[PDB]
UniProtKB/Swiss-Prot annotation:
Highly expressed in heart, lung, cerebellum and brain. Detected at lower levels in adrenal gland, stomach, thymus, esophagus and ovary. Cytosolic calcium-activated calcium channel that mediates the release of Ca(2+) from the sarcoplasmic reticulum into the cytosol and thereby plays a key role in triggering cardiac muscle contraction. Aberrant channel activation can lead to cardiac arrhythmia. In cardiac myocytes, calcium release is triggered by increased Ca(2+) cytosolic levels due to activation of the L-type calcium channel CACNA1C. The calcium channel activity is modulated by formation of heterotetramers with RYR3. Required for cellular calcium ion homeostasis. Required for embryonic heart development. Disruption phenotype: Embryonically lethal. Embryos die at about 10 dpc, due to defects in heart tube development. Cardiac myotubes display enlarged rough endoplasmic reticulum and cytoplasmic vesicles that contain high levels of Ca(2+). Belongs to the ryanodine receptor (TC 1.A.3.1) family. RYR2 subfamily. The calcium release channel activity resides in the C-terminal region while the remaining part of the protein resides in the cytoplasm. This is Ryanodine receptor 2. It comes from the Eukaryota. It is found in: Sarcoplasmic reticulum membrane. The modification Phosphoserine is found at S97. The chain holds residues 2700 to 2904 of 4966 of the full protein. Channel activity is modulated by phosphorylation. Phosphorylation is increased in failing heart, leading to calcium leaks and increased cytoplasmic Ca(2+) levels.
Length: 191
């Protein structure tokens, strides 16, 4: 097993994707904030572990560039892989289905039920390729970690296509999420 992730070191993201990166990063932050809230954290001015106060629980537009980058970075990494593969990416006029969807800083993040969104057979297949690439990224890093600890093995150091569903899940869910968000935000990806 020699995992080689798609090399995206020289990929430039075209301007047409900036809207998406900003919107999906905002969504990712809203998800993070809602998860924090469910775990007993609230917004406040000064961070505290003991009081469970998280100054990051505010609107995405109010975050610093470094704070936004936490969310933008992996999204950009995912998009660069699509771009490296030459996948066609187009904004559409009528495809932004999320538009129709029915506290400090007035912040009220809402969940999106992604299980309401369906991917075509071809898009599911493209998501599987993305998932496999996420696995290869992890696997290459793990293979290097082990080699540098003197050796050893790992049950997940096999090709993605030989993993079971439970083992595929983390990477599959990440891949399906970006494709679903592309769809509902008005982008059409094809090959």
């Amino acid at each position: 097993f020699n995992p080689q992730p798609v090399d995206t070191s020289n990929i430039t993201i075209p301007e047409k994707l900036e809207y998406f990166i900003n919107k999906y990063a905002e969504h990712s932050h809203d998800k993070w904030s809602m998860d924090k809230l469910a775990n007993g954290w609230i917004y406040g001015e000064i961070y505290s572990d003991s009081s469970k106060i998280q100054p990051l629980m505010k609107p995405y537009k109010l975050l610093s560039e470094k704070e936004k980058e936490i969310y933008r970075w992996p999204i950009k990494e995912s998009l660069k892989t699509m771009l490296a593969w030459g996948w066609r990416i187009e904004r559409t006029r009528e495809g932004d289905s999320m538009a129709l969807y029915n506290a400090a800083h007035g912040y009220s993040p809402r969940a999106i039920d992604m299980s309401n969104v369906t991917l075509s057979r071809d898009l599911h297949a493209m998501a599987e390729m993305m998932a496999e690439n996420y696995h290869n990224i992890w696997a290459k890093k793990k293979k290097l970690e082990l080699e540098s600890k003197g050796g050893g093995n790992h049950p997940l150091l096999v090709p993605y296509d030989t993993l079971t569903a439970a083992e595929k899940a983390k990477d599959r869910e990440k891949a399906q999420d970006i494709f679903k968000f592309l769809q509902i935000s008005g982008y059409v990806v094809s090959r």
